[PDB]
């Protein structure tokens, strides 16, 4: 995020970091319940990637961070790899995340909800802070 | 490096798809929602994470970070997967699995 700010540690408790098999953060995601994470289809997640819940600082090493294996990836079959439309994938965890103060779920909208143009929302992540 | 270490956040406005298409044209599809062009931007490594909006005292997932400016420009809207257009599929997948 460019021109953002440091989040309060643990205040976005559904935010997860997706790490490849070498330990490299490559994408974010969001817990929707103790067994499932929603992310983007373009991230190309596989069952050799790991879901990291309860993290805020990437350089920290703590047993209080949950590294959760992925049992199966559910890519939406409508995903268009050229236009990037329908950019969503579900990750079914092998073992359930343990919810706590720093690990919990985000709410999902209904397909009929209206989030009006002009509404102030928030985005979070460990992306670059400058290009 | 321009890597952050600690989790970042930013507040930003949702745009209408008509306004988003002023910049991005026909790249904007109905299952996309744009946000930003307000002085903040998502950038490399943010992909897949959340765009949340407060509704009834709680945060709801409205977008999934999808794609945007080549250079993370803060005057161009970011493009997110529009979760309302994809949540029936989410709910169907969870009910069957």
């Amino acid at each position: 995020i460019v021109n953002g700010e440091e989040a309060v540690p643990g205040s976005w408790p559904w935010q997860v970091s997706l790490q490849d098999k070498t330990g490299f953060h490559f994408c974010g995601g969001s817990l929707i319940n103790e067994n499932w994470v929603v992310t983007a289809a373009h991230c190309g997640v596989t069952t050799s990637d790991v879901v990291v819940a309860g993290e805020f600082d990437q350089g920290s090493s703590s047993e209080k961070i949950q590294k959760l294996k992925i049992a199966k990836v559910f890519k939406n079959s409508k995903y268009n790899s050229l236009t990037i439309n329908n950019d969503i994938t579900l990750l079914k965890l092998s073992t359930a995340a343990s919810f706590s103060q720093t690990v919990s779920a985000v709410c999902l909208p209904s397909a009929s909800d209206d989030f009006a143009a002009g509404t102030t929302c928030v985005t979070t992540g460990w992306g670059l802070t400058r290009y | 490096a321009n890597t952050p270490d600690r989790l970042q956040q930013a507040s930003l406005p949702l745009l209408s798809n008509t306004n988003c298409k002023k910049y991005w044209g026909t790249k904007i599809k109905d299952a996309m929602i744009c946000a930003g062009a307000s002085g903040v931007s998502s950038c490399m490594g943010d992909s897949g994470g959340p765009l949340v909006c407060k509704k009834n005292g709680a945060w709801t997932l409205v977008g999934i970070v999808s794609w945007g400016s080549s250079t993370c420009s803060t005057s161009t809207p970011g493009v997110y997967a529009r979760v309302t257009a994809l949540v029936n599929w989410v709910q169907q997948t969870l009910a069957a699995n």
Partner: peptide, 12 residues
């Protein structure tokens, strides 16, 4: 869902 036990602080 959606109510962090640790409230986020938004600058806006």
């Amino acid at each position: 869902c959606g109510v962090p036990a640790i409230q986020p602080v938004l600058s806006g």
